[PDB]
């Protein structure tokens, strides 16, 4: 008399969750990212992960997918100027 066990293996990949309304990929800038409710205010975020036990210290590695761009401009001979921007989190300094 026997019992059954099932499992799956999936390496060389990262788990993805998109911030889109229908989960599809309709462009670089998802429609929810432009929604007024998430754009003209502030909100707090809470996440809860449940994993399986292991017998050594480990790390949970999270990637917030954002926009990161740089613009480079050089008016006169021997001059380089740049402007960096990361939209959801930070951009240089102020004042």
């Amino acid at each position: 008399d026997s019992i059954t066990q099932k499992k799956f293996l999936c390496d060389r990949t990262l788990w993805r969750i998109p911030f889109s309304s229908n989960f599809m990929s309709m462009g670089a800038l998802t429609d929810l990212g432009q929604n007024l409710l998430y754009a003209n205010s502030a909100h707090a975020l809470d996440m809860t992960f449940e994993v399986d036990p292991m017998d050594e210290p480990t790390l949970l590695y999270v990637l917030f997918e954002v926009f990161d761009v740089v613009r480079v401009h050089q008016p006169h001979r021997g001059v380089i100027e740049t402007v960096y921007l990361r939209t959801p989190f930070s951009a240089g300094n102020a004042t």
């Binding site: 809470d46 992960f49 449940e50 994993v51 210290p57 790390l59 949970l60 999270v62 990637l63 006169h76």
Partner: protein, 49 residues
């Protein structure tokens, strides 16, 4: 080490003159384009908020 295309002087000067206007700038973006965080999971734990 570096390598230059041996482009003609008239064409190179014209391209240089055109690529200095305040509207023909250049742009780039990191392919991954994300911000990273690392949180510790102590041994034998199972819940991470």
């Amino acid at each position: 080490y570096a390598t230059f295309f041996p482009m003609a002087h008239n064409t190179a000067s014209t391209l240089e003159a055109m690529l200095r206007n305040d509207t023909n700038d250049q742009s780039f973006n990191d392919y991954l384009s994300a911000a990273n965080m690392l949180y510790p999971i102590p041994a034998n734990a199972t819940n991470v908020p």
